[PDB]
Amino acid sequence: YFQEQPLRLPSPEVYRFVVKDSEENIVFEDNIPIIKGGTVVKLIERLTYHMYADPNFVRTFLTTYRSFCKPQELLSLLIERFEIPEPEPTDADSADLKRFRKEYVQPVQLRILNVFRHWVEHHFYDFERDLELLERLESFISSVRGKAMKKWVESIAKIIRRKKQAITFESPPPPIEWHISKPGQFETFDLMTLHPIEIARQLTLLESDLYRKVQPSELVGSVWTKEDKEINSPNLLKMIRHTTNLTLWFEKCIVEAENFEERVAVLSRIIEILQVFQDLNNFNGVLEIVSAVNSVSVYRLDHTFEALQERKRKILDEAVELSQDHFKKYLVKLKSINPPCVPFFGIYLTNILKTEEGNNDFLGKDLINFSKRRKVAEITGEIQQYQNQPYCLRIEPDMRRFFENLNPMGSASEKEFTDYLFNKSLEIEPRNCKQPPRFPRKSTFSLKSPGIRPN
Ligand SMILES: NCCNc1ccc(C(F)(F)F)cc1[N+](=O)[O-]
Numbered sequence: 001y002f003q004e005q006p007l008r009l010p011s012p013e014v015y016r017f018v019v020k021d022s023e024e025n026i027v028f029e030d031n032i033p034i035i036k037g038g039t040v041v042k043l044i045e046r047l048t049y050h051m052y053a054d055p056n057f058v059r060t061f062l063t064t065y066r067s068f069c070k071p072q073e074l075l076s077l078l079i080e081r082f083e084i085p086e087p088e089p090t091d092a093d094s095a096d097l098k099r100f101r102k103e104y105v106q107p108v109q110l111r112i113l114n115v116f117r118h119w120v121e122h123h124f125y126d127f128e129r130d131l132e133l134l135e136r137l138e139s140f141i142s143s144v145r146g147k148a149m150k151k152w153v154e155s156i157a158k159i160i161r162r163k164k165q166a167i168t169f170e171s172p173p174p175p176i177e178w179h180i181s182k183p184g185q186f187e188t189f190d191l192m193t194l195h196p197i198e199i200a201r202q203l204t205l206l207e208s209d210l211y212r213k214v215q216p217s218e219l220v221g222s223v224w225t226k227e228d229k230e231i232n233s234p235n236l237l238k239m240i241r242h243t244t245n246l247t248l249w250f251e252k253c254i255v256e257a258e259n260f261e262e263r264v265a266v267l268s269r270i271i272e273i274l275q276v277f278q279d280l281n282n283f284n285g286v287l288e289i290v291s292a293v294n295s296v297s298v299y300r301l302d303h304t305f306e307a308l309q310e311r312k313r314k315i316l317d318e319a320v321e322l323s324q325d326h327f328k329k330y331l332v333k334l335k336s337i338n339p340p341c342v343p344f345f346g347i348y349l350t351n352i353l354k355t356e357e358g359n360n361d362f363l364g365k366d367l368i369n370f371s372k373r374r375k376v377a378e379i380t381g382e383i384q385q386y387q388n389q390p391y392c393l394r395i396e397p398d399m400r401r402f403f404e405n406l407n408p409m410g411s412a413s414e415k416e417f418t419d420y421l422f423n424k425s426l427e428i429e430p431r432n433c434k435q436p437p438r439f440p441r442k443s444t445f446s447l448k449s450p451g452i453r454p455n
Pocket of ligand 1: 211212213214215216217219236239344345346348349380381383384
């Protein structure tokens, strides 16, 4: 309701962050204002604005900035923003200078240190991937002089020390289940020799830990599909590669069982493991098995599926329904169950890949489209903010290592391995055969399942 005297600022030629706002360097949305886009200089200016604090923009920026700015560039810009020159003395030469220091220099310099604090607290992986970046930040933070900023400086270093350093159960976990293979002899571990309960438990723990380690920045900008995927998305790729190898493992176990009765038992055991996956709300494991039975080499084995117990076939059909109609039943099932759970990552990745292709990276000079990043950060934010629980199950390390190091493809490549599985599928059940041919049983152990009831 009143316009006060404007602050006397340095020239834009000496401090490029005070260049005047224009639709050619920054754009806002008509919905604290909401930034639609701009130059990275204008984005940094609003990231450390002097008039107000903007924690939502800080959180969103530090999650998404790798899609439009490198971590080294971000640090340089923040340091450049910190080193604010004072305006050249008036043509007559202190009232404007005292005002400039209290209302502009101190607020901006404190906003930058808050950005540093959020950066090292919530995204220290940047400094683990780039040690030169961390030594630049420590060198700059040491050179920071001022008693008002000492609390901030020692707070940043306190967090860095914590990050440079780096189970227990609420209720007693149930005992580990063993079938034919016994503790220690990892060389004999296999789908049918291990216990179906414990296969599902150990893969559920493994897939829960893999899922928990994925951070939003590994998804922003689809960086897991681009040139630097191994560096920017190491946890997400481990999640994708585990799911690929486990899906191929279930397919291999079925098709390589040439004896018909052995193959029906193998498929039956897999449906039992699926049964425990559903008990544990492990939807990743459920859809791993559905993907395997939907492979062309397994799906065509009509004699195998028709020999199943009707109860086990209805369990499998129930799980196949989860994915039908664009995962309609899966979405309402996930919303209804309670944690601990392991949601399916695939639907999230397609959501993000679809908005990445729809929205443009840029909005005179081409300006970074930050609204696109805010939309992508809102998808990942819904994943991060789900209140999930750790599983109350004990880890068996040898089984864990067995599932970690599963390599079903052997020496063959992707297309060669699918050719091998489809040719083997045609051998064990030929096209238009009246009954499956008889093959010798390769297992020297019984295929009777111990069930999925514990104790
Ligand atoms: N930190 C655990 C929660 N976060 C999380 C988990 C999984 C995924 C994905 F994509 F793999 F499905 C993505 C995220 N995310 O981006 O938040």
